[PDB]
Design a binder for this molecule. Structure first.
Ligand SMILES: NC(=O)c1ccc[n+]([C@@H]2O[C@H](COP(=O)([O-])OP(=O)(O)OC[C@H]3O[C@@H](n4cnc5c(N)ncnc54)[C@H](OP(=O)(O)O)[C@@H]3O)[C@@H](O)[C@H]2O)c1
Ligand SMILES: COc1cc(/C=C/C(=O)O)ccc1O
Ligand code: NA
Ligand code: NA
Length: 342
């Protein structure tokens, strides 16, 4: 038996970063703990006290576990994108019961000191977890990278790495809707089948089973690649470079094969031979397009023109393993943690 607190103290489970990470992250680099909270905003707060509902696992989070976005603080909760319910607000834009997405804590209850970088959700006729993926930062990344960086055109050939993931699965669908020929690489038969059968990619292959990536790309792109949407780097980038078309483009979205350990790109001469534009981008520079993105994507989801696959795990207790799993390809589609459905 446990008495209720006569001071309104309740339990707040948290995922702490125990210490900074070298090499690949391990579950034991994080600690599940139970903190206490009074569900009350600090005096003068212009922010929100929220109940966290869903948390995103995103590849960039590993970089914040290295001591030097600013690093995570050892001894403090992991932070990252999530979907939350407002309990109390210092900003009358938000009231109790409103749903938000934005950066929040890996904990049951967070205080978010400023609301300037929160989005108030209005459309709730989709799974709320979508606001960590297709309707959040990964969806924005796919939209900006494909439409704003790749200068895509009907009939162009498109190759996507990590193609069944949060970003890649949308890039391929956008490209198919534009009338492009689209191929994806992924790390399992299950993901290759998902690309062809759920997302409508023209083709896909399992890079882990291909000893000769150049021959795999030539199988699918006998006249080369107009657009490479780069999520992985490493061996796949070297294999792609000789297969680019003249005036081809490489949108450098991510390089996840290098996030935990080093790797040299050896085929850059093909940028000259094929007059290729290889261009990095950050989703943050395109958030001004978010409302225009939602005007396109919401009806497309409703009409079944776009679809999405999430990997959902239950409880904060699952969050450390779900985050480390990104670097092993454990996720099938966009990795979500359910902290609380309501
Ligand atoms: N603003 C930005 O520029 C921006 C924003 C968001 C994301 N990104 C980048 O976009 C990429 C995809 O993000 P996402 O959220 O869509 O992740 P995701 O694809 O849902 O998950 C990561 C995937 O990476 C693949 N992977 C992991 N280690 C690998 C390796 N060593 N070699 C090849 N593939 C590996 C795995 O897929 P397989 O099973 O297929 O191997 C894994 O499922 C990441 O590089 C991320 O950093 C950049
Ligand atoms: C949002 O996701 C990403 C962001 C970055 C870079 C951020 C910065 O340089 O400020 C890199 C890879 C990512 O997946
Ligand atoms: Na073409
Ligand atoms: Na990695």
């Amino acid at each position: 038996m446990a008495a209720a607190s006569t001071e309104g103290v309740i339990s707040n489970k948290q995922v702490i970063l125990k210490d900074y990470v070298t090499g690949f992250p391990k579950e034991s680099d994080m600690q599940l703990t139970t903190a206490t909270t009074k569900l009350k905003l600090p005096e003068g707060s212009k922010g929100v006290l929220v109940k966290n509902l869903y948390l995103s696992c995103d590849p960039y989070m590993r970089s914040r576990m290295t001591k030097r976005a600013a690093s995570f603080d050892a001894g403090s909760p992991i932070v990252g994108y999530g979907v939350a319910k407002v309990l109390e607000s210092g900003d009358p834009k938000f009231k109790k019961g409103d749903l938000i997405w934005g950066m929040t804590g890996w904990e049951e209850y967070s205080v978010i000191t400023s609301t300037e970088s929160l989005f108030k959700i209005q459309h709730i006729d989709v799974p709320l977890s979508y606001y960590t993926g297709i309707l959040g930062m990964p969806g924005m990344t796919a939209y900006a990278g494909f439409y704003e960086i790749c200068n895509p055109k009907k009939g162009e050939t498109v190759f996507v790495s990590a193609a069944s993931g949060a970003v890649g699965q949308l890039v391929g669908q956008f490209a198919k809707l534009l009338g492009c020929y689209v191929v994806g690489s992924a790390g399992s038969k299950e993901k290759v089948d998902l690309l062809k059968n759920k997302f409508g990619f023209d083709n896909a292959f399992n890079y882990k089973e291909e000893p000769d990536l150049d021959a795999a790309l030539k199988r699918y792109f006998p006249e080369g690649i107009d657009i490479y949407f780069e999520n992985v780097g490493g061996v796949m980038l070297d294999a792609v470079l000789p297969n680019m078309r003249v005036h081809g483009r490489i949108a450098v979205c991510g390089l996840i094969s290098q996030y935990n350990i080093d790797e040299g790109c050896h085929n850059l001469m093909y940028l000259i031979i094929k007059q290729v534009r290889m261009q990095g981008f950050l989703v943050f520079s395109y958030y001004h397009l978010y409302e225009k993105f939602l005007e396109m994507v919401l009806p497309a989801i409703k009409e079944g023109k776009l679809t999405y696959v999430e990997d959902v795990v239950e409880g904060l207790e699952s969050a450390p393993a779900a985050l480390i799993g990104l670097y092993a390809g454990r996720n099938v589609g966009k990795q979500v943690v359910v902290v609380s459905r309501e």
